[PDB]
Design a protein around this ligand. Structure first.
Ligand SMILES: CCCCCCCC/C=C\CCCCCCCC(=O)OC[C@H](O)CO
Ligand SMILES: [Ca+2]
Lengths: 32, 32
């Protein structure tokens, strides 16, 4: 087979951190 | 190693849930 536990965690934590970065950037670009 | 179907489903849903709440949070905050 499915996915290794390390690959999944990396993908997901990566997904979420990116989600946060985008959210911050939308907020601040919205301050302009 | 390999991730069970149950855990994969739990993780995928946990990700989705945190994603929409992060989006909601920025919706609210951007409104201030
Ligand atoms: C292999 C591990 C990858 C780590 C990735 C972490 C990302 C999920 C973070 C928070 C979920 C919190 C929301 C709660 C939603 C239901 C609980 C849940 O996610 O359950 C997972 C568990 O594996 C059920 O078997
Ligand atoms: Ca995502």
């Amino acid at each position: 087979s499915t996915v290794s536990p390390g690959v999944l965690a990396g993908i997901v934590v990566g997904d979420l951190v990116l989600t946060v970065l985008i959210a911050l950037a939308v907020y601040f670009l919205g301050r302009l």
